[model samples]
Target: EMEKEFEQIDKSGSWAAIYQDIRHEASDFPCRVAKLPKNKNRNRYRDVSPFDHSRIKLHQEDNDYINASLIKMEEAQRSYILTQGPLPNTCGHFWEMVWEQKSRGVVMLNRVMEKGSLKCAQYWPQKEEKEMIFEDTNLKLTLISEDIKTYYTVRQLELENLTTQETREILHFHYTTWPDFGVPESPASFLNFLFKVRESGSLSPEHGPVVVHSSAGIGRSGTFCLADTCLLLMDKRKDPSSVDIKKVLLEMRKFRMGLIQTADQLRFSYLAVIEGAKFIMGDSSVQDQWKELSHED
Candidate 1:
């Protein structure tokens, strides 16, 4: 039934229509903190910012602003800290949020360089033996191991607090091939990557919200959270048809403005949800195909 609705929505050019409606209803409440002179450089883009209500703050001395928001999906027992990819200057604050929240993992949806543009800073230590330290936050990230796949890479890193000398392992999941302002090549591959993140227990109820980020932290980041939240809700209800994808995205946008930034991103959310539903709803065969397709060179 909902599968047919998916098809019908696609057939009617309804994504654009729905995107318009969401834009109409989405809150654009003033982001006063993000605009202040003291925190102005913390934002990656001037026009992009988080609402003060759900915004994440740093408690460090003389610093409190970080361009991140804590999005909670209470019913699903899931939450995500969605923020822009860290700017070079704000890299410490990024890890500071992760450490303070006690988040288990970070889902990176964009590369440091996208096309000819710098979408996100190389915020973590890329070399296996080297370490990157955020002096401001007194946090350092050391690369432990990395499993590179064609479309995505799973990495393990050590996040340590230099002040207390406390160390914890953090999972870094990077989707390497997803283009900015566009969707992945297929839902199958995307689901494979999604499931990999799921298996790690990162998005589970036990830990703090995984930090999800892209360039502006709205477009691709919103798509990732929306699909995960809707799928989890469907699994809980034991019915794929029970969840409403649009409604969930709208709820998410309340915590942070302009989620699922483009009409195409909204459409891709539907596609991923529909594809993911097949597994939780009954069909397990897609998992095998997803694994094979996700690593295609």
Candidate 2:
């Protein structure tokens, strides 16, 4: 069935054309809220815009708008805050959003520098540095611990509210292997990384939505969420085929502009969803299998 679905999509057109068609349809949706001049500077890149209906709103005193969208799957009980890689000027607001939202994790899909270009700003503290203080937002981010992995890195970040002196721990999951506007090498490696984030208990509904981003925050970021949501739906429905991956992706695109950026990315999302569904369907050792596969790479 999956093979046939892929064949059908291919017969229609290239994934790039499909992606563009969806984006063009989404462009017709009213984004008047995001057109405010003040929010323009909040965006890192002019082309990467957030949908007004679903954009994250900061209820705080400064910088009420952030180029971020809230994607919520009520049935699966999964929520994600998808946003662009923070610019140097927006790092303060980035931390502020993390603080205000009470988010337990920040999932970064791209590296600070990819192929010798700046893909994302270093929004968190470095290993050599004890803490990063954002005076504009009056928040102090301290690095508590770092766990190195072959395909990804995990960091324990402590976010402190300077005025209240209240602090919280936020997990930072960085997938080091994923390239800009590209998919990971294999679904196994990607699933291994996703499970690592899930194991942190950061994606739980008990906490605020996890902040997910790459360079544009829509390409790799959207791919990650689509795969994760599909697997979650499989577990909830108790059947791998119960979830319509294409339908879910379209629903998600309504909340944000462009997701699952390329044809390759769209294909990879399917592969990851298929592989991840096994773990959700009582494959107790499936996760262990993926872990080994990731390490062998």
Candidate 3:
């Protein structure tokens, strides 16, 4: 079912048109929380705001505020707390949400600084010797270990609740190569990075929803979740042909707005989904082809 739709999208270049359609349909959803006086400047952009109904509410002792959303996919048995990259003032709140939500992993897809602009605050500790103390939130973040890979970096973070002195380990998976406004060079490298995240066991249902963020939490972040959810559905159904990528993405957007931001992102999601399907089918040619195209970036 999806293959034919994918073919039509490829042949007619309708990805952009379809993306616009999705956006138009998305405008009808209630994004009223973005206009709240307390959350006025919390969002990075006016266009990339979370819907009021689905937004994550922070149980901060002093205030109930946080610009995040809890996106759940029942079929995949996965829940992702999607939010923007932390701003300077919101770093404490970001970590607080992670702790309160009991998240096991953080999937960060953007760099701290991008394209001469600050995309995300340094929300976690940078060096082993340096620990980040979010005094406002009374949380201490320590870097346990860092494993730098070719296309991504994995860091084991130790988050401590200062009041209780209780600590929990959080896996940080940062995909390094994807640009701020563009997709990865190829799906091979992307799928490789994605599989690394899956192997960590942090995205499992037993853990709380993983916190996923890019700059806006709706482009690269959305692509990652969409591909992950689609691949899992394909795995469960035991038939790659049974999954509908478009439908899954639409369902996810209902939880948050403007997911898979660009047509290019939508295209990349399809490519990654197809590549994942190939892997699940035990196709050796897919690996060989991926290796050949993998060296470009």
Tell me the TM-score of each prediction against the true structure.
Answer: 0.97, 0.93, 0.93
State the lDDT of candidate 1 residue by residue for 1-297, as single tens digits: 568888899889898898899889877666899999988889999988989999998877787899999998888878899999899899999999999999999999998888899999988888987899788889989999988888889999999999999999999999988899889878988899899899999887788889999898998899899988898999998866668877888899899988887888888888898888888877989888898877645
Across 15-68, the per-residue lDDT of candidate 2 in tens digits comes to 777666666655335666567787777777777777778888777765578889
TM-score of 2: 0.93
Error of 3 at 86 (Å): 0.5
TM-score of model number 3: 0.93
Give the Cα error of residue 229 in candidate 3, in Å: 0.7
Instruction: Measure candidate 1: CA RMSD.
Output: 1.2
Ranking by TM-score: 1, 3, 2
> How large is the C-alpha RMSD of every model relative to the true structure?
1.2, 2.1, 2.1
lDDT for residue 189 in candidate 2, whole number 0-100: 94
Report lDDT (Cα) of residue 165, candidate 1: 96
Model 2: per-residue Cα lDDT at residue 188: 90
Candidate 2 residue 263 C-alpha distance from true site, Å: 0.5
Candidate with best lDDT: 1
